[PDB]
Amino acid sequence: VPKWIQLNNEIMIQKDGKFQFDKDKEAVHSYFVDYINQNTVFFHNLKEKLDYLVENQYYEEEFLSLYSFEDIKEVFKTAYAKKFRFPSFMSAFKFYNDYALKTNDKKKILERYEDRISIVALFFANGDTEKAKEYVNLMINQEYQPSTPTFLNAGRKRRGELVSCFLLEVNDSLNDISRAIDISMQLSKLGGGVSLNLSKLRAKGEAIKDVENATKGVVGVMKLLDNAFRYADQMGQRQGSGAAYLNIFHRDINDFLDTKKISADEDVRVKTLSIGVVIPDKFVELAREDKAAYVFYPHTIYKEYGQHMDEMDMNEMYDKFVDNPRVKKEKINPRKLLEKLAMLRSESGYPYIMFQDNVNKVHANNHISKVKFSNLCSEVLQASQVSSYTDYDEEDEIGLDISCNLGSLNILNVMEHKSIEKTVKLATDSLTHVSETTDIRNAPAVRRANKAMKSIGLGAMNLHGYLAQNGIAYESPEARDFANTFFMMVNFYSIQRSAEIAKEKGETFDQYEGSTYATGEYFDKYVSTDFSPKYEKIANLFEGMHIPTTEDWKKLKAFVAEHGMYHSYRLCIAPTGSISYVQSSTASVMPIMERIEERTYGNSKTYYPMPGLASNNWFFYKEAYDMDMFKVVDMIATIQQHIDQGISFTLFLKDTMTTRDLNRIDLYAHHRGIKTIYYARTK
Amino acid sequence: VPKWIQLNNEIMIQKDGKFQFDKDKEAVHSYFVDYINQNTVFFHNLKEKLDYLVENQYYEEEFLSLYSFEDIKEVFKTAYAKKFRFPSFMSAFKFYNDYALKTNDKKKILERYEDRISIVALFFANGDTEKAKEYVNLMINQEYQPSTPTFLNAGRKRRGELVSCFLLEVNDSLNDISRAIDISMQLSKLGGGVSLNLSKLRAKGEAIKDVENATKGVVGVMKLLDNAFRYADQMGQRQGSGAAYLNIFHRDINDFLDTKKISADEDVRVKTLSIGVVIPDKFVELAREDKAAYVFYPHTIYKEYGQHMDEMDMNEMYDKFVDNPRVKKEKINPRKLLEKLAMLRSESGYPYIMFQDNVNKVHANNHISKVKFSNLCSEVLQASQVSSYTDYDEEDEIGLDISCNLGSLNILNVMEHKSIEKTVKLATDSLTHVSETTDIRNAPAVRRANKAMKSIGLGAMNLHGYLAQNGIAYESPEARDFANTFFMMVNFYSIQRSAEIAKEKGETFDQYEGSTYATGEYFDKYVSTDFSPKYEKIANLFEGMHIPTTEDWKKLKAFVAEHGMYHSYRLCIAPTGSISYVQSSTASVMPIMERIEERTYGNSKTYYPMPGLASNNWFFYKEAYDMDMFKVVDMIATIQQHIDQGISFTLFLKDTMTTRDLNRIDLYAHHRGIKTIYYARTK
Amino acid sequence: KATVEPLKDDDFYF
Amino acid sequence: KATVEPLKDDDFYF
Ligand SMILES: Nc1ncnc2c1ncn2[C@@H]1O[C@H](COP(=O)(O)OP(=O)(O)OP(=O)(O)O)[C@@H](O)[C@H]1O
Ligand SMILES: Nc1ncnc2c1ncn2[C@@H]1O[C@H](COP(=O)(O)OP(=O)(O)OP(=O)(O)O)[C@@H](O)[C@H]1O
Ligand SMILES: Cc1cn([C@H]2C[C@H](O)[C@@H](COP(=O)(O)OP(=O)(O)OP(=O)(O)O)O2)c(=O)[nH]c1=O
Ligand SMILES: Cc1cn([C@H]2C[C@H](O)[C@@H](COP(=O)(O)OP(=O)(O)OP(=O)(O)O)O2)c(=O)[nH]c1=O
Ligand SMILES: Nc1nc2c(ncn2[C@H]2C[C@H](O)[C@@H](COP(=O)(O)OP(=O)(O)O)O2)c(=O)[nH]1
Ligand SMILES: Nc1nc2c(ncn2[C@H]2C[C@H](O)[C@@H](COP(=O)(O)OP(=O)(O)O)O2)c(=O)[nH]1
Ligand SMILES: [Mg+2]
Ligand SMILES: [Mg+2]
Fold first, then answer.
1. Which family is it part of (chains C, D)?
2. Which residues of A touch B222 (CB under 8 A)?
């Protein structure tokens, strides 16, 4: 047995009635001095290391050529001056197993944490030495963490894309379905997760050029996409991951949900394709009144009105669709559909739930389009325009397919350094650079929307870690007060950085003038309501850091109106799965699942205590399953009001609660303004 | 029970020790008088019928506008002047159930046999009244039958494509694989069977741009294509049919064959994708000498030589592949692979066997490309060039994808009319017209090859019917003598008509100058060997008809050298599945499976004696299973020497025959020059 | 499977 | 599955 995992297993050996948490420091120390320093390739000087990495196709020469080697040396000194030490064995293990650069035979280790951070910083700065040093300070302090694609591939030659979330709109045509399959395989080949909207596709039993009952529905396209994602699996190390989204008023909604039932046949069930359901407020209202709802055939609506069903307002056109004789509709029970959704989430965790009117009542770019679906992680909520892929000889009408670059602030380290403003602005700059350097040459709509919208996603993690290490319960009102103030400040500084970038570059995102930022309606609650902490305990947490007031928000609103905004979307809180270990942080803003996390890697068993877990804060690290999901919904809704995109909201359910409890949680989330619900995890 | 169904069922009731074959005339008469004349929409004049058909979106006004109504009336007069009578109930039933035009609700009948033939002839002539009358005489005499797509769809507004066989080359790239899936779905949407060459795709466990062992091989593409064909199910009317071809020296050949095993896993098995194996002479030579053979990874060969493995001659390059250390290969037993092929064909009828060197040793367009694979019916053998479908922004390199137009001579009716020359030339003209009027907007390589090659397929049928009705056994040497003479005449007159069309239009097919027609090497066996019948009985069958001699072939060779050749390919003998009933003919050049055909339509069972079956010729209608497959191979090889493309050669096997017997039949077919083997049908 | 309990009218108000 | 029988040579010669 390895010495470091033997030391790491001494955490669970209870001495004097307490877990031996200090063993993990010894575990990581042994891990380093027995595996990492031995397996690390060491060079005489940094020049030899950089030459070796560039020559043997490990790095990219173009980005390293913008700095003189003295500047690169200064950046590397800045990284190593911090003398960063991983606080736990899991942090270092995850870094050196997932993100650290290794030789071509996966034998030795080329990059340390400082080397990877310096390379990512030099990639971000794009020739600026001082900016590279600022990025080095930001990441070595672990105040900001670039997403797994960016952190893993920044500055590497044989790399995937820096963006891994893509959202595709599929038009109701065979040419568009073929193009969707092709683009899904191309983006899965790049390593990205692809989400597809299947609402515009006509339902099963619709006509294809005046021959009736000809269309196979969205389930045939679902099978096509599932096999396309199985094919594009990247060696199978990380198999192709796709998501399909359907509006709840689509006629194929029941067949769409039946693809996830355990008793589904092999000719229907999809395995590699996640599913999400978009629920307008009309459906919730119909279920609330116990009235008879109707699902509609999309092609009939398109023929009658000239627009797709999901491109229309259901809360204003549902009655017109029902009364229209030329529209084909099927009678359903909305409460039965809700119960089926709850049962499916209990048994499989699917579908993702998107509350469409919750997304679009605060959506800043409804003039471009309404948000019709989310991503595979169920947190990207941006306007999309469907493309019109025509025959081979004809030109294609390219729409807007969503993609944003992810990045997480570490709430604990940002709050410790009292650097919300600087971290948010530097992270915004880095995400802007990642957006500018991303060029997808096989997804035309993704390319066009990346160039036009310039959308970024700046998330946060370690919310529960910060609260538990500060003696604040996750469900407590003080926690929600802190989240309100913190994320209002993050929104303020992200908007300020976006406006400053627009002023410097002299350009805004496409169709900015129709957005709520341009009209000033976005800033109404910020110029009217003060978001300063209401509790003295929380107010001391922000001591030494300026909290923008209503006057500051009015000044920012004037600044945005006079200079514009560079990013259509700025903030989205992703799950942040594996980078949370490296940053020694709790995953996303969701509460922790286990206080001490037990994992098996190969034939070795190792345990990961939550960051900062001890006996003085053992009960503040309350597990997500033991807490009220209503209070978690309250917390996420408090955070969501400052996030322009969505939050990957996982529901943590006990075995005792029924499907009615899950439905109640979903309805309370819809009532409280939750935009999306990610997973129904059951213990 | 219908009266005609009862009358047709009285055939099996044996009266005086003989079947009541005359009951089928009563059966068809009752069928007509009781159902067809009742359900046939009648109009006061032909003008009213034509106006109703064009204005109700049944016909195309474009082709009918090319004639004055007087010309159309005279064409219809010519069709009805013959007073054509269906000899059997099954002929009329098949026509009025598959090809006759029905109302939009499929309740009444708009088109009689004469109406359908007149419309097809008017579409063929393209404005010529005398040509339309000639086509009417050719088809109402049932000397020439246009293929099911052409006969069914010609002159129809809501029609599918007139071509139903397509052959696509798939390049070793994700872009090309996605484009192949798209084109397969587009062509299956049109109702055409699609054949895909998978030999260029790199095998399983190959490197994808420095990531070794990352390719799923040809089986992942097979699953993608199977789901693509299942989705593109011809508007839910007829199941989507596709074929995949792999070279026997491809590394994935065993995985390719395992997709058809009865015990195949659901993640390997393909349901709607037929498979064909391409076998060069090198494999047969290795199996003959029992030397252990090698299957090669195609991408290693492409990297080493810059050419695809299937683009190179295996006979000369096999030793270089084996001796090359940079070419990856695995040892196989060629005899074990042959036994596996025979076992698979016994179990499921798959794969099709294409003898690569048998095709290419007589191929007239080897300069353009070698024939690498066949169609879904295993008779189309044409040169193909793979397309290089690049990224979306880049320009694609369009190659040549095979698609030929099918037509069948009725050997009995052509022979009784002594009109081999006239029928062959008119059929060539009609197939040329179908080729010119075909434009496919979503298969650029298919469209380019249709425009450039101008290839047609003129088949034959009713060989066994003609022989049995003339007192000639199918396995007899006299039958092979007749086939030799008849198909030599067919080839002569098809070449003459093609050269005449080239002279009239002043243009040949693309890259004709490199063909064996241009160099005269094609005509060597025709200017050196006499193909007149060697039997007095057979020579009497051609009385009143000039059989081309050696001097006639020399004159044709000079004419082709002077004026060129319009069609790269002219003759291919398709199975002719359903049009054989309408023509009262035996299917293709194959012998009859059963003397009397027992089939069930709806809840009523039907009986179909073979055309011309009686007491005198009962034993000349020997069933195919009772026949010696070696003699059938001899017959098909006699025909194959005059057919430039292949022949759909079905093996009719008994249950008692072994795997060794099927292998012996395949090896004798290879020895005798058989190009393709279609099906292994076991009784 | 998780126990299926029907939704009440009062479940839609908070 | 009719009956598997190996090729015993002389089946490649005619
Ligand atoms: N927890 C850790 N995180 C990161 N690197 C570590 C860690 N523990 C050891 N190392 C690596 O091993 C080297 C030697 O570790 P060691 O415990 O001897 O530290 P030191 O810098 O020599 O002394 P000290 O930490 O006692 O001041 C470090 O320089 C570092 O590269
Ligand atoms: N075997 C058949 N094939 C085609 N049409 C048929 C057939 N039998 C009957 N019909 C149709 O039914 C009609 C009635 O023919 P029937 O044998 O009852 O007497 P008919 O009017 O004297 O025939 P005909 O017009 O053929 O000389 C025919 O004109 C023809 O349109
Ligand atoms: C992308 C991808 C390709 N393949 C197969 C299909 C292709 O024939 C082959 C790679 O084709 P390509 O997609 O063209 O590979 P590449 O251009 O990225 O790199 P290279 O050409 O140097 O190999 O691998 C898979 O099996 N799975 C996959 O996910
Ligand atoms: C061709 C085809 C289409 N479809 C469905 C999927 C598409 O969303 C939908 C549109 O097909 P289209 O490609 O648009 O067919 P079309 O344009 O000829 O028909 P229309 O005039 O009505 O637009 O039909 C099938 O389900 N199976 C098929 O084989
Ligand atoms: N020598 C050396 N330095 C490395 C390597 N990887 C990262 N570095 C960092 C450590 C220092 O902060 C910086 C400069 O190291 P160096 O080139 O040895 O310079 P110096 O120690 O002579 O000033 O580069 C490496 O492999 N070798
Ligand atoms: N009357 C009529 N003729 C039809 C119909 N379908 C096909 N025909 C053929 C029969 C004749 O050969 C041709 C002309 O028929 P017509 O218009 O009645 O001609 P005429 O005999 O009055 O000069 O059209 C049909 O529905 N009605
Ligand atoms: Mg369409
Ligand atoms: Mg390639």
1. Belongs to the ribonucleoside diphosphate reductase small chain family.
2. none
* Exposure letters A241-262 (e unless 16+ CB within 10 A, then b): bbbbbbbbbbbbbebbbbbbbe
Would an 8 Å CB–CB cutoff place C14 in contact with chain A? Answer: yes
**Alpha carbon distances (Å) from A559 to A364, A496, A501, A570:** 17, 8, 12, 17
Distance CA B175, CA B107 (A): 46
Query: Which two tokens mark B264?
Result: 């195949």
Tokens of B469: 């009705």
Contacting residues for A457 by C-beta, under 8 A, at least 6 apart: A165, A379, A380, A404, A405, A406, A407, A431, A569, A570, A571, A572, A574, A645
Q: CA-CA distance, A662 to B194, in Å (whole number)? A: 49
Q: Which of A26, A85, A94, A112 to mutate to test the pocket of ligand 1 (most atoms within 8 A of CB)?
A: A85
A178 at interface of B, judged by CB pairs closer than 8 A: yes
Name the residue with tokens 């250390």: B325
Within 8 A of C14 by CB-CB distance, chain A residues are 667-668, 671
What CATH number should be reported for the domain whose range is B143-280+334-683? 3.20.70.20
As given in the structure block, the two tokens for residue B464 are: 């066994």
Ligand number with the minimum distance to the CA of B189: 4
Pairing of strands B273-279, B242-247: parallel
**Contact, B593 vs B651, CB < 8 A?**
no
Q: Report the DSSP pairing between strands B679-682 and B650-653.
A: parallel
DSSP string, A543-565: TTSPPP-HHHHHHHHHHHHHH--
**Binding residue numbers of A for substrate:** 148, 164-165, 193, 375-379, 575-579
B659 touches chain A (CB under 8 A): no
Method: cryo-EM
Query: Domain residue spans in chain B?
Result: 3-142, 143-280+334-683, 281-333
CA-nearest of A228, A241, A240 to A180 is: A228
Please state, in angstroms and rounded to a whole number, the distance separating the CA atoms of residues B651 and A160.
Answer: 51
Of A220, A235, A392, the CB nearest to B214: A235
Q: Residue holding tokens 């995937």?
A: A160
Cβ separation A659–C5 shorter than 8 A: yes
Asked if residue B234 lies in contact with residue B191, where contact means CB atoms within 8 angstroms, the answer is yes
Cβ neighbours of residue B473 under 8 Å, at least 6 residues apart?
B467, B479, B620, B622
Angle between helices A113-125 and A420-437 (to 10 degrees): 70
- A262 Cα: distance to centroid of ligand 2 (angstroms): 61
Instruction: Spell out a b/e string for A39-56, using b for 16 or more CB atoms within 10 Å of the CB, else e.
Output: ebeeeeebeebbeebeee
Token readout for A446 is 């993704």
Q: Is B115 in the pocket of ligand 6 (CB under 6 A)?
A: yes
Q: What is the Cα–Cα distance from A205 to B235, expressed in whole angstroms? A: 10
Identify the sign of the CA torsion B524, B530, B533, B534.
negative
Q: Ligand 6, residues B40, B76, B119: which to mutate, most atoms within 8 A of Cβ?
A: B76
Task: Return residues with CB closer than 5 A to ligand 8 (ion).
Answer: B 173
Q: What is the spatial distance between Cα B226 and Cα B229, in angstroms, rounded to a whole number?
A: 5
By annotation, the residues of B acting in catalysis are 375, 377, 379
* Alpha-carbon span A340 to A349, nearest angstrom: 12
Verify whether the Cβ–Cβ distance D5 to B659 is below 8 Å. yes
In the three-class reduction of DSSP (H, G, I as helix; E, B as strand; rest coil), residue A142 is classed as coil
| Partner residues linked to B406 by β-bridges | B457
Are A346 and C2 a contacting pair at CB < 8 A?
Answer: yes
Residues with CB under 6 Å of ligand 1 are: A 28-29, 32-33, 37, 85-86, 92
Going by their DSSP bridges, the two strands A352-355 and A273-279 should be labelled as parallel
Bridge partners for B600 per DSSP:
B605
Residue A362 to chain B, least CA–CA distance (Å): 35
